[PDB]
Design a protein around this ligand. Structure first.
Ligand code: ZN
Ligand code: ZN
Lengths: 304, 98, 69, 64, 115, 44
RNA sequence: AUCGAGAGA
């Protein structure tokens, strides 16, 4: 039979690495239907904050207004999504945005020529002032009560060195972007993960022993750290199959086509969650699991 | 509201029924299907999205008896919640340990 | 025209790497592969975005109607 | 009541050149939520000699 | 997608006849609802968003003693890219009669277009 | 100064019943300038 | 309105 108790007894997690942007962990003895649900929720169901509505006041640059607003929307922000609520779209725009659901950025950059430019120079940072507009220039403007809630944590982009625009003297950009909560199933600019996928643990089943000069080339058909040689007998064996990406280079050789089969461990997933910068990958995974649980609970409490 | 019983495909005794869920997809559909197929009493379970462009999910449950398709759905939802809770707890423990 | 802020296929932010890529090509005698590797672009989907960018905005910028030429 | 075209209504399709009567049939209407393209099953490609590399076809709506 | 049209106001008159229409607004009771797209000189603002039926130009007609506007005649909305004031090459210094208005159309790739 | 010359790029304002030409030079093409007005968009 | 160039299946 199957039960939650049996799943708890047979379930394990092996966290291989954990950084501020990328976490690599394993889910062991879990079903593909659940691993895929976690992956999908991480990709396109975890809320994040990104620019949605842009209020241009002037744009005399080469970049058109729609392209500039889209490029601003694509920037990731270092904002904790829990610090603001969701926007009720039914309300009119006069009071649709409040102090607790919208973060108002601004950009006011005006290019002028630098009279002190060295002769024969071509560098735009010496020829001109504000020749390059960067994401770090997106100045956070606190509104209402959030001047106290965001005092410790300023609203700055995850990458401040993103090249939003370029200018030439006389050209100015003056906008004011509103960034709100949204999910990656609505727009790809909201997905809190760069990529969040998994893979089955590779399996390298050695059928017949390979020894001698043959074992030399068998090791080279894989990444160097996967296949090893036993010290006692000059055999071949699988040291670490996690270090293997399935390129099936062995199957190209008739020497080893009959001496090894390639497969997977169908209930051993190798996750890899890279975050855009708004939140840690471990928190992203936590929120995906909690989103699946709350989705199931809401469906259960819905009256059929 | 969100969960809808398709009365034109439901057995008179309740042993078989078909459900329509709005704003759902493969994510919840496959998880619910897997967690319901573990019920020893269900005879037939499957999920289907009528059209990809629409946000509707269809769940079919056919029990062998002594229960209801609604009861099987409730048990599957509870077991899915328990599975999510146990994986979250194990991940939390591994994060703390490292 | 102007460097894409995010990679199309995956979504990794590559818009903050164009200038550093040009610096790695110019100052150091690094080829494109080594420069892309050092910038942190692992997947070829991310590598193509910076490897094949044309940066036509530099040519677009010389036609400035707000400046005496 | 000049009501809209529901799912129960019937429509007549046609793809020029109409070399035979099979190239103009009466389909059933299914109102989809995305815009600006006529969705056709793959069974009708042989009937209409149609394709999906830029082909277009007309949709006549009978009124009685 | 960039579209350009020549709003040639000097197409009714011919061979030195007096100027019939002047770009701008008159003293008549023209509705103030159409000032959101037109500058004080009867020309559209740069970057403004125009749909079907909204003004593109505004000229006062002396043969009518009433201010008449033109209209964006296209089902697809667009933004004003640039407005060029063209003056006739004749040695005399006439009024403004030819203005070029460019539109910008956002062609986001949708279902149906070819790749 | 609502207009810009198309050859010398000098700001100039035209009154009514005035010559449609630049003042610093003799170019007959005048580009309209972009003022400060709100243009709402969507970061899509 | 007519005649010229081109494009899609
Ligand atoms: Zn990528
Ligand atoms: Zn001039």
């Amino acid at each position: 039979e199957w039960n939650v108790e049996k799943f708890k007894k047979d379930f394990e997690v092996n966290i291989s690495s954990l950084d501020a942007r990328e976490a690599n962990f394993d889910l062991i003895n879990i079903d593909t239907s659940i691993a895929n649900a976690f992956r999908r929720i991480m990709i396109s169901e975890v809320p994040s904050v990104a620019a949605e509505y842009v209020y241009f006041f002037n744009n005399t640059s080469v970049i058109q207004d729609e392209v500039l607003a889209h490029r601003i929307g694509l920037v990731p922000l270092k904002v904790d999504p829990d610090m603001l609520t969701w926007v009720d779209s039914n309300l009119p725009d006069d009071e649709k945005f409040t102090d607790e659901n919208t973060i108002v950025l601004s950009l006011n950059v005006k290019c002028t020529r630098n009279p002190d430019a060295p002769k024969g120079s071509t560098d735009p940072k010496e020829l001109y002032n504000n020749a390059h507009v960067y994401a770090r220039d997106l100045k956070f403007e606190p509104q209402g009560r959030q001047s106290t809630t965001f005092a410790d944590c300023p609203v700055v982009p995850a990458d401040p060195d993103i090249l939003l625009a370029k200018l030439r003297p006389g050209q100015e950009i003056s906008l004011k972007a509103h960034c709100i909560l949204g999910i990656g199933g609505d727009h790809a600019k909201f997905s809190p993960v760069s990529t969040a996928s998994y893979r089955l643990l590779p399996q390298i089943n050695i059928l017949q022993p390979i020894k001698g000069e043959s074992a030399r080339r068998f090791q080279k058909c894989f990444p160097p750290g996967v296949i090893g040689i036993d010290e006692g007998s000059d055999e071949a064996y699988v040291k670490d199959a996690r270090k293997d990406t399935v390129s099936r280079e062995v199957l190209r050789y008739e020497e080893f086509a009959d001496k090894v089969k390639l497969g997977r461990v169908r209930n051993h997933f190798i996750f890899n969650v890279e975050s855009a910068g708004a939140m840690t990958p471990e928190e992203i995974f936590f929120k995906s699991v909690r989103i699946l649980k709350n989705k199931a609970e809401y469906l259960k409490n819905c009256p059929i | 509201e969100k969960i809808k019983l398709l009365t034109q495909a439901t057995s008179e005794d309740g042993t078989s029924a078909s459900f329509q869920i709005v704003e759902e997809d493969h994510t919840l559909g496959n998880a619910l299907r897997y967690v319901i197929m573990k019920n020893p009493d269900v005879e037939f379970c499957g999920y289907s999205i009528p059209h990809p462009s629409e946000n509707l999910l269809n769940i079919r449950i056919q029990t062998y008896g002594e229960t209801t398709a609604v009861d099987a759905l409730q048990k599957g939802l509870k077991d899915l919640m328990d599975l999510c809770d146990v994986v979250e707890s194990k991940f939390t423990e591994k994060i703390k340990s490292m | 025209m102007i460097v894409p802020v995010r990679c199309f296929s995956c979504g990794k932010v590559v818009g903050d790497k164009w200038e550093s890529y040009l610096n790695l090509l110019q100052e150091d005698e690094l080829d494109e592969g080594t420069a892309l590797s050092r910038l942190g672009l692992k997947r070829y989907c991310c590598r193509r975005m910076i490897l094949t960018h044309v940066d036509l905005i530099e040519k677009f910028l010389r036609y400035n109607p707000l400046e005496k030429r | 009541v000049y009501r809209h075209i529901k799912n129960r209504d019937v429509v007549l399709m046609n793809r020029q050149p109409t070399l035979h009567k099979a190239s103009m049939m009466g389909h059933k209407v299914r109102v989809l939520p995305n815009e600006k393209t006529l969705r056709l099953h793959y069974a009708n490609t042989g009937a209409y000699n149609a394709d999906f590399d830029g082909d277009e076809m007309n949709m006549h709506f009978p009124q009685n | 997608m960039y579209k350009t049209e020549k709003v040639d106001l000097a197409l009714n008159r011919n061979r030195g006849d007096p100027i019939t229409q002047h770009f701008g607004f008159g003293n008549d009771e023209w509705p103030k609802e159409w000032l959101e797209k037109l500058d004080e000189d009867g020309l559209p603002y740069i970057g403004t968003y125009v749909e079907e039926g909204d003004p593109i130009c505004a000229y006062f007609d002396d043969t009518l003693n009433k201010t008449k506007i033109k209209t964006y005649h296209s089902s697809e909305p667009a933004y004003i890219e640039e407005v060029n004031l063209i003056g006739d090459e004749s040695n005399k210094f006439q009024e403004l009669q030819t203005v070029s208005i460019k539109y910008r159309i956002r062609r986001t790739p949708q279902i149906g277009d070819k790749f | 100064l609502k207009y810009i010359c198309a050859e010398c790029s000098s700001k100039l304002s035209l009154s009514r019943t005035d010559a449609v030409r630049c003042k610093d030079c003799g170019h007959r093409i005048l580009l309209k300038a972009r003022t400060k007005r709100l243009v709402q968009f969507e970061a899509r």
